[PDB]
Design an enzyme around this catalytic site. Structure first.
Site, PDB file in Angstrom:
ATOM      1  N   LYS A 244       0.899  -1.175   0.000  1.00  0.00           N
ATOM      2  CA  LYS A 244       0.000   0.000   0.000  1.00  0.00           C
ATOM      3  C   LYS A 244       0.923   1.208   0.000  1.00  0.00           C
ATOM      4  O   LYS A 244       1.231   1.805   1.051  1.00  0.00           O
ATOM      5  CB  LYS A 244      -0.914  -0.017   1.246  1.00  0.00           C
ATOM      6  CG  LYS A 244      -2.181   0.860   1.174  1.00  0.00           C
ATOM      7  CD  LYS A 244      -3.181   0.302   0.159  1.00  0.00           C
ATOM      8  CE  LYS A 244      -4.385   1.191  -0.006  1.00  0.00           C
ATOM      9  NZ  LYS A 244      -4.788   1.220  -1.432  1.00  0.00           N
TER      10      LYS A 244
ATOM     11  N   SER B 216      -8.771  -0.576  -4.531  1.00  0.00           N
ATOM     12  CA  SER B 216      -9.070  -0.184  -3.153  1.00  0.00           C
ATOM     13  C   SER B 216     -10.600  -0.168  -3.012  1.00  0.00           C
ATOM     14  O   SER B 216     -11.226  -1.222  -3.103  1.00  0.00           O
ATOM     15  CB  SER B 216      -8.433   1.190  -2.860  1.00  0.00           C
ATOM     16  OG  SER B 216      -7.599   1.155  -1.709  1.00  0.00           O
TER      17      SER B 216
END
EC number: 3.4.21.-
Lengths: 478, 474, 476, 474
Positions: free
Chosen positions: B134, B334
């Site tokens: 991430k 996401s």
């Protein structure tokens, strides 16, 4: 019956965007109408709000004023003062009136630019110049703190000449030698010191001006030659802006007139620039209109985009290949890309004071990776080829350097080849007078880049000579 | 009669010239295939600024189809950018200017990283994260890409460029490495040609002919005929060519767009509004004429809370027995993936970018920055949990709570995806941790059901119910 | 049948630039109308939104106020507070009311200017000054860090006079000595300590004000005097803004009024400025209109462009040469260029508080070549003469310097020559009262620059007297 | 015909210049209470950004009345902010998401302090002040709070937070320390629970049920029924439910707002205009059908000359025989208290912030800042009092007059309050000195007469006046 009052306010231009922008051709054509018109008995030039034009354009308005005078109508110039630009135009007058406290402000020509190498080093900006042309000096600000010796010699040549043409023209207009129009700084100061600093007596004693006279003395003399109008409460006259230019009768044999006024950009015409596709579409129009018998391309461009230029060139070349002769009229600037677009023409006419050539090519890449580094900003990322990290915030990769240097070498060969084939020459002979060297129209005529010294009249007459005998003009201002 | 003129101007987007609709383009090409009045297609792409790879491949398909019907497709231009050329390469016949270039250079990513600026400025950075990969948090804490982030991004950028080359290869019938031989190869091939880029393109068959604007005009008027009226070859522009408004059968499939970053409010700027989108799904879920839903997703994500609102209306629709099919088109990562989770079926293009199942929060405060210019703060609080503002130090109590909230958000994400993709939380971890995946890698690890485009997602939707359909848009 | 409500909002100006800007003349002419109108029984001044006027101008309204008063109608002033300027006007009233906690804010006059020689040196700026005028002081900012002694002397003289003019007028209006209107800062501190920092009691015991009251009491007192309007739920009154000034009868035989209000520019008008061409055309209309028998030039101008001043002057001179008398009316300011244009008139009248003179000439050139050099920026190019080589980014060439200095020497000689020919003097005599020195209308009168001390009324009357009969005004 | 849905969006204010009127809200709840078309209320406060505690308590009071007529009040949300939950707690039933949070965290005060920066810039600061506790001036003169300020500020913030707790504790019938146990307790409770915030909320009784959005829509239909037309539960939004316009009885009570900072001119921005308010009070005084005046105040104060203009008009309405009652709503401090002194009667909410009887003024000049960059000012003055521009030092004569002026202003102030509160300057001094006081502290020390709300202000005005009354506004 009255005078034509030439109270031009603003600048002279080839084509628009007491107005701020005034059309050169509309001024000239109005003067020529005033000439043959029984109801006009004279011109008065009131140039206080006149901001200037290039030398080739002002010389053209001048020609119209001589033709006017040669008909035996007086042309007067009045004012409290003359800037160097107003005086040039005013000099074509029979008679020049100055205020007794006024100045004729002659001071010469100067060129001026900023140079930032040292500032780029301090900001840690990375600079890359790809260029072919020893004299292609628009590049110098990124890489010098001063103009190069080559740049200096090319710029001195043209400017020294444009200024000699200013003096020769004005000298002839006033019938005094050039050194008396402007003796240089030492002599001007000496002259001004006799007269105790009185600029207007210096002007009168040196024949720059015919009479010194107040605004009310001027008015008395003007009502005496033109008469008094009870409605207007002035001498009899009608302003340029109210005088109606009779819309010309249409024949059927027309000569198309396409403007390339400004920096040449890729798209549609925006701002005050040339749009490659807009101009190409105007050329196409004339190329397919059976009515239109020849094209005149009126060029006033420093250049711009190479892809844009090519697009315009292609079209003119098609027009000429379709059997419609193409004549270029250069007015002030027709350099770099503006020379590029002129090449396919049957005939190129320039004004002696025109700035042309600059046959060369350059590209500049600045990057800021080190400037950002010094304040702790970095960039990072992934690519599939180094050819893909070209961005302002990244170092230029050497792969991209190689391609850029090859592109620029190739583009220069393109330019000198086009000109070589256009001018009945050889790429090797064109190299000798190219390398980015800017030439006045006089130099360009001498070295083959242009065919004759002249003006828009001469361009039109030539286009007509490549066919037939009663023409009218189709403009594409639409 | 006449050509259809694809003089596209601007960008391609799912949902709005300058913005052009992907679906109107494809459907017009498809209508033009069956229209006796169109006799071919000319692509003039000079003002076409790009689209994402899935979208252009879609428009490709329609061009292949138009082509397969016996009508010609032509590409003309002075030059081609890498976007323009991908598209043009679907044409039968590609025309280049003798001084033109086909400008192939690859794909690249680039972002700002600021650890050192923030340190010089004396800013306090507070990072709350779950996801090694991430990486969108890296600019606050690194001066460069992490080794982990570099592998993840090289993987997918690698794949996407290969997809580009393979498609253009197949379209030109020449090997991929002849389409683009790499930097050296391109340099060596330009040298050999005196730096003539157009001769390079023509010898390597990127292009089929070198020719001038009026050489192309002629060749085009021979093919399409001359119009005394317009003084050009016979052609109507895509922008003037009326696409027919299809008949309302009476059994519909609702199409809802989640195009953009996802925002809490309603449809703002160029964003997705949680509540506008939730309401569009509610509309479709309760209209008895609507037999299924297709959620057309192209989103980087955004607001988790706004994600849920959308996801919950979608689950409601499925729970009431209306099949929900997701059609991913470019990005669905996401929270673009969070809203995609309740679908019966999920289809992505192989070049789609998805996954990025992870969670992060960043707090920057400026107390030390202000202090050094002699500006301070002070006040009273009833709890350090109340003392939370840009000008004050982040209280350790506040830090513990934010850490806990992010750990929980992560568990929520992977649980949602585990339940929805028939896996366990621990298994979803092994392929979540923030990592971005192409449609291909996603299909391979269970996150996606099949590779295709909008055509397939529609087809799957009508098949999860019954057999004659029209589309309803919102 | 009400009071006239002078609830003036904004500033007073010679000519509003088409409240905020209120016309000097409309105010004065509306008060005079209100004097003969049986519908107006008094004036009430409410000046809380009154932001000021120049002193000659407020003096002129004052005069209308005294005339209204002398006819037996009362003038009352009311406020919670009075600013220094608000109180000047207020003071012409028969009776002044102040809030019981309010202040009369008298503090004096002050000049204030920025000086940045040190800055320009730090910034490596090159400065070039071309000046003739020892008291032509508006140049000092570029070359000093404070006033020159010469500048202090000149500015002290006029500021002193104007503040005395203010005190003497206000003193007279209140019938108390001028030191009691304002005892100095020390005296104010004293009077206020004795009172516990209570400004209203000071004001009331020193007779600056007549009575202390809240809004709701004044109301009572004013409806006693003017009667109560049931319809408007207020004492009987009408605002200045609603009360119609009558357009005067038309005679045929007019005196023309041309304004020269503001900085003098070369263009035509547009701004808050005087445009050379625009003012010349107005003067021309009046010059050629056979109806117009005289011209008055109402001047309030700091000056500006020499060449635009010349344009205006020449039309004025022509007006006079054609047999129409020109009378100048100097308002707040008529200095430098504003004096230049005044010069051709038969007669110059100024208010004693007018600032005029300032006969001199100046030129400043700053260049930034050394400022650029220190950050690695440079200029370069080619020229056919150093005279062509002039712009902000280049050194001023020595050849250009010499030319600008000749120019300035010659401009000064133009000016004093003009003035000397217009005020029956010699050039060598005018030098002794030129050198850029600013003077009050009073110092102006005493040195011959101005013919008499008075106001607009006196300029008109004089214009008519230089022709004849009964008149009326054509404005432009 | 269904629930009144309070889907309040934005903030509560006294008078709207996004902005919802406090009184329109209260008066709509009371209308719905007795309208047989409304069977209940649903609170949806997702878009509600808050209001002051006294105002929310006022709305809560009408909710309690509504609830006591036997119609239910529901609170539904995915999450609850602290402001939102205060309001929601007046509901019969509070529904939370199972992913949701009740964000309780306390109150904080924080401000900038500039002294260090001002000295760095060489600025000259002149503070004229009476009042040990007049703390608004501290940012010009120091780096941090004085002990005096942190005592005064801890006191009122503490009291306001405890009123928050007590109200919410009473609403949920649990003890205060259970509503919010402090940072330690909250973090532990959230640990006996795996970081699950909804489960924390349900187990500690902040919330009545955890429920999906569709599980809420199912229980909300059923109670209120389904509308085939709207395709939701039967319900009408606050914004669509017309509040009926009350009759013209014959006797009115004037309501005049003083909302925001008090400036000198006409009303501008979101501020009080000294002359505007006065004209309103003056119309009240002269309109013979107005028998009493209520002055609704929510003001930190501001300009003293503008306060006096207002005070004087009000003192005049009272002397003209019309009773004046003040209703304080949130703030009525400094000038906001000055203007309140003429009233027959003052009512404050216990959480109202009032008092701050004290006075200050600041002059900053920049002569030394300009000196250091080589800029100076010079000129001639006929008095030192005329040299008062920001670039000039403040002359010693002006300093002395300014201090004497501020001294006298404080005397005028404790003196007005002494007359108005049946006290002596000596007694008022002990409770003045700039000290801020909550409603409850002000009632105990005699600055306020009773604790209550707008209703009590009105009832009290009618009592001092007489009979049957309607409200006239301006």
């Amino acid at each position: 019956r009255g005078a034509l009052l030439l109270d031009i306010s603003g600048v002279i231009v080839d084509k628009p965007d007491r107005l701020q922008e005034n059309s050169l051709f509309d001024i000239v054509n109005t003067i020529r109408q005033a000439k043959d018109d029984r109801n006009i008995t004279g011109i008065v030039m009131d140039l206080k709000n006149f901001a200037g034009g290039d030398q080739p354009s002002m010389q053209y308005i001048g020609k119209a004023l001589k033709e006017f005078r040669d008909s035996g109508k007086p042309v007067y110039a009045v004012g409290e003062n003359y800037s160097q630009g107003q005086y040039y135009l005013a000099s074509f007058a029979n008679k020049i009136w100055l205020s007794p406290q006024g100045v004729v402000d002659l001071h010469g020509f100067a060129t001026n630019g900023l140079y930032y190498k040292s500032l780029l080093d301090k900001l840690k900006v990375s600079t890359h110049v790809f260029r072919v042309g020893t004299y292609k000096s628009a590049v110098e600000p990124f890489i010098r703190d001063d103009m190069s010796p080559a740049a200096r010699e090319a710029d001195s040549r043209w400017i020294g000449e444009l200024w000699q043409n200013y003096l020769n023209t004005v000298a002839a207009n006033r019938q005094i030698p050039a050194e008396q129009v402007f003796p240089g700084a030492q002599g001007l100061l000496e002259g001004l010191t006799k007269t105790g600093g009185d600029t207007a007596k210096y002007a009168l004693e040196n024949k720059l001006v015919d009479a010194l006279a107040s605004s009310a003395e001027i008015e008395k003399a003007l009502t005496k030659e033109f008469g008094w109008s009870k409605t207007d409460k002035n001498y009899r006259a009608i302003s340029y802006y109210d005088y109606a230019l009779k819309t010309p009768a249409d024949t059927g044999d027309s000569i198309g007139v396409v403007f390339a006024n400004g920096a040449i950009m890729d798209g549609e015409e925006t701002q005050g620039n040339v749009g490659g596709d807009t101009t190409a579409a105007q050329i196409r129009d004339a190329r397919l209109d059976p009515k239109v018998k020849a094209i005149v391309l009126r060029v006033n461009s420093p250049g711009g985009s190479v892809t844009a230029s090519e697009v315009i060139r292609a079209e003119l070349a098609a027009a000429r290949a379709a059997g419609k002769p193409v004549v270029v009229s250069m007015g002030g600037m027709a350099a770099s890309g503006g020379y590029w677009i002129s090449t396919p023409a049957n005939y190129i006419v320039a004004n002696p004071s025109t700035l042309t050539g600059s046959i060369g090519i350059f590209g500049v890449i600045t990057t800021v990776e080190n400037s950002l580094d010094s304040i702790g900003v970095h960039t990072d990322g992934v690519s599939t080829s180094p050819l893909a990290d070209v961005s302002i915030t990244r170092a230029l990769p050497p792969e991209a350097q190689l391609m850029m240097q090859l592109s620029i070498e190739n583009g220069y060969k393109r330019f000198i080849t086009l000109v070589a084939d256009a001018r009945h020459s050889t790429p090797e002979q064109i190299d000798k007078i190219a390398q980015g060297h800017v030439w006045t129209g006089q130099d360009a005529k001498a070295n083959g880049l242009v065919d004759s010294l002249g003006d828009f009249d001469d361009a039109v007459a030539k286009a007509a000579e490549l066919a037939k005998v009663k023409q009218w003009h189709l403009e594409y201002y639409v």
